[PDB]
Structure formats: C-alpha cells, structure tokens
Amino acid sequence: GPLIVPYNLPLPGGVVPRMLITILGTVKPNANRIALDFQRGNDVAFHFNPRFNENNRRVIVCNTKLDNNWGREERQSVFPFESGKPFKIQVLVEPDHFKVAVNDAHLLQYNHRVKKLNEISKLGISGDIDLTSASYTMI
Ligand SMILES: CO[C@@H]1O[C@H](CO)[C@H](O)[C@H](OCc2cn([C@@H]3O[C@H](CO)[C@H](O)[C@H](O)[C@H]3O)nn2)[C@H]1O
Ligand SMILES: [Cl-]
Ligand SMILES: [Cl-]
Numbered sequence: 001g002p003l004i005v006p007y008n009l010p011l012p013g014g015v016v017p018r019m020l021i022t023i024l025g026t027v028k029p030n031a032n033r034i035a036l037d038f039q040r041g042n043d044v045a046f047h048f049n050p051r052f053n054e055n056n057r058r059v060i061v062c063n064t065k066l067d068n069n070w071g072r073e074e075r076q077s078v079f080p081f082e083s084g085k086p087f088k089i090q091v092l093v094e095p096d097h098f099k100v101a102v103n104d105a106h107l108l109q110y111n112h113r114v115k116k117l118n119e120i121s122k123l124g125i126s127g128d129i130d131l132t133s134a135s136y137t138m139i
Contacts, residue, residue, distance in 0.1 A: 006126035009134045011038075014118035015093045023089040023125060024133035031083045031128035036091070038098070039122045042068070045114035046098050048091075050081050050127075064113045076108045086132075092139070093117070 002025075009021075015038065023036070036048040044065035051059050058079040064071045080102040081087055092099045097109040114120060125134055 003131040003134065005129060005131050006124055007131055007134060009123040009125065009136075011121050011123055011136065014040075014116070014120045016117055017093050017095045018139050019093045019136055020139050021091040021093075021123060021136045022133070023091075023131070024086070025129040025131045026086040027081055027083050028128040028130065029084045031081075034081065034127035034129055035124070036089070037124040037126070038091075038120050039124060040114050040116060040120045043114060045112075045120045046091075046110055048089075048100065048110075050079065052081070052083065052128075060108065062108070062110050066114075071113065074108075074110060078107060080105065080107060 027034070031052050033052065034050040036046070037044050038046040047061075047063045047065060049061040049063070051061060060076045060079060062074040062076070088103055090101045092101070097111045099109045100107045123134070125131060
C-alpha cells in the first residue's frame with residue numbers, strides 16, 4: 001500500500017556522508033512535478049524538483065532555500081522519469097555533495113550550500129507520485 005504524499009521522513013540527527021536515502025514510487029500519469037526537500041528547519045538544504053512540463057520541456061530543478069529565499073538554481077536536462085512508470089531515487093550523501101542516481105544510473109550531484117549537515121533532519125516527498133517506500137541506511 002502506498003504511503004501518503006506529501007510524506008515526511010525524519011532524518012534523526014540529520015544527514016552525514018555515507019548515508020543513503022532510497023525513495024521508491026511510481027510516477028502518476030500526466031504528472032506535472034516531483035519534489036524532494038531535504039529540510040533544515042524552515043530552510044531547504046537540497047530541493048530536487050523534476051518538472052515534467054516547463055514550457056513543454058522536462059527539466060530537473062535543484063536549489064536551496066534560506067530564510068524563505070530561493071537561491072540560484074542548478075538545472076539538469078537529463079530527465080530519467082516517465083509518467084506512469086516506477087522509479088527508484090537514491091540520494092547518497094558524500095562529503096562535498098548530494099549524489100543522486102535514478103534507476104541505478106548516476107543523474108546529478110549537488111554541492112552542499114547548507115553546512116550543518118547534522119541539522120538537515122527531515123526529508124519531505126511530494127508531487128505526482130504513488131509513493132511505495134522511503135528509507136535510509138548507512139553504507
Ligand atoms: C524557466 O523559467 C521558470 O519557469 C517556471 C514555470 O515552469 C516559473 O515561471 C519560474 O519562475 C517562477 C517560479 C519559481 N518557482 C520556485 O522555484 C523553486 C526552485 O528555485 C522551487 O521549485 C519552488 O517550489 C518553485 O515555486 N517556481 N516557479 C521561471 O523562473
Ligand atoms: Cl513524461
Ligand atoms: Cl549552515
């Protein structure tokens with residue numbers, strides 16, 4: 001049975017290198033967006049935002065939100081998600097960046113702008129997905 005979206009996954013004591021977060025789900029048909037939000041309190045340390053129809057293009061927007069202001073976006077035109085299809089997102093925390101693979105293929109990395117990794121204590125998962133699983137493990 002699917003989890004309820006938007007879904008909140010506590011990250012006890014924040015994130016740390018060698019921490020692997022795995023999100024399993026299926027994209028809804030005619031999906032418009034997906035969002036992962038690694039949060040430090042109200043701040044979003046790492047925002048991972050696949051957009052299925054931005055001016056008829058598919059793009060993943062990544063960014064950080066500090067004191068309610070979004071920063072400079074990082075955009076990646078490789079777009080492995082497809083409406084209707086099951087996906088696996090793996091977010092591996094490394095010393096200098098978040099490393100994201102989708103369906104076992106490296107997708108992008110996002111350098112740490114928020115430095116207090118052990119305060120990034122919650123992951124919000126939202127958008128047009130049926131969420132199957134969300135978990136973490138130390139590798
Ligand atoms: C290609 O240009 C863009 O096209 C967009 C529509 O597809 C919008 O018009 C953008 O400007 C408005 C905007 C800003 N944002 C926020 O960006 C955050 C990450 O930086 C987060 O994703 C945040 O949720 C989200 O609302 N969303 N829309 C515009 O810059
Ligand atoms: Cl699609
Ligand atoms: Cl910080």
